[PDB]
């Protein structure tokens, strides 16, 4: 039901590694995990757990940057949301951008 | 060899049936289709055929928010680069963001 | 010091009238208060904050995104942008933020400049 | 009545001495040049037109990207951005083109006027 992707808009490839949190307002954590290799984050939740409510997904960029050597801006990308959803974000050192799908 | 993926900001959805056109600088055409219900749209070329080269991507986003009853700013939403590719536009109707991926 | 600015995808235009709220990170790491105010006919938000009141830290900038696309009869699926970065660590530097938005996506961009 | 305003998200900072070309559509389906120039300081790229030159049609807006990274020691993908629009078509407007680049993307959006 829920899927974050991750993209790197300086080197033209998946975000792999990176940490993501996804929080519900009650911020209960609520699922988290890293990066595959493809740049995506599967299993992350189920049917049963993930309920309307208000959600933030939060993933840690920073790290992400300073292990490749790039200083950057940010402390994270993200999302918050009233709530299948894919959560995809695009990064660079001094931006980011995000946006939902849900089919 | 390349692969394009459509998604709509405004709606939250995929950008389903949207003309791609692909042209390689001599602009000789050299691929087309139209996105799938998932907003993707595979099979353009061949990797014989995907030589390195100057491509344009001009995806055809009038025609998609006039189909939706939205008055759209732009003709097109594209990327016009130098050479797996994956070319992924986000659409709304006074803005465009498009990103490629090379994997 | 701080300036935020925020576009409108929808409409072509400068979101005006949004509300901006900035935090601070504190101590107990949790987020303070620390100046807001709304975007003006230009989308742009001067006046923030001061030299003397922006120190070092992490600061949240959030938009309310939510109320913006409501009032405009648009349905949000961004409740609000919360945009965090650490100011100033290595002296005194302005920060321009700038957001475009759309109903189920948001870019934001920074530009810093050493004064 | 034409404005056009680059973004640099590898630095944070306005794209500078950045080539920017207009074109408008012929009516033989080819692109003639309509006017040109380069970003200022701030990233902005004022004077392009005037009311009276800036009729209605198609016109093509082609940021050089390509050099702008590459003099920077940066790997483009991007070649340049080509961003088109039916401009004035129901009367004169004003425009704002802003673009915010990085190496493998580019986001572009509108702010339009009715003067
Ligand atoms: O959504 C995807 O599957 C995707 C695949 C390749 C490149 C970018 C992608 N997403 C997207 C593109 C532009 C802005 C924000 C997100
Ligand atoms: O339009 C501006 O004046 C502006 C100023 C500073 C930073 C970004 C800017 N616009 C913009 C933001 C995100 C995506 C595309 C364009
Ligand atoms: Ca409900
Ligand atoms: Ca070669
Ligand atoms: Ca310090
Ligand atoms: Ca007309």
């Known amino acids: ?58 993933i840690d960029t920073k790290s992400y940057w300073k292990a490749l050597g790039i200083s950057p801006f940010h402390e994270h990308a993200e999302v918050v949301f009233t709530a299948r959803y894919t959560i995809a974000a695009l990064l660079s050192p001094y931006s980011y951008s995000t946006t939902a799908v849900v089919t």
């Open 1 to 58: 039901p829920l899927m974050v992707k991750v993209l790197d808009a300086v080197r033209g490839s998946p975000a792999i590694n990176v940490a993501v949190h996804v929080f519900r307002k009650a911020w209960e954590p609520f699922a988290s995990g890293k990066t595959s290799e493809s740049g995506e984050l599967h299993g992350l939740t189920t049917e049963e757990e993930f309920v309307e409510g208000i959600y933030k997904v939060e």
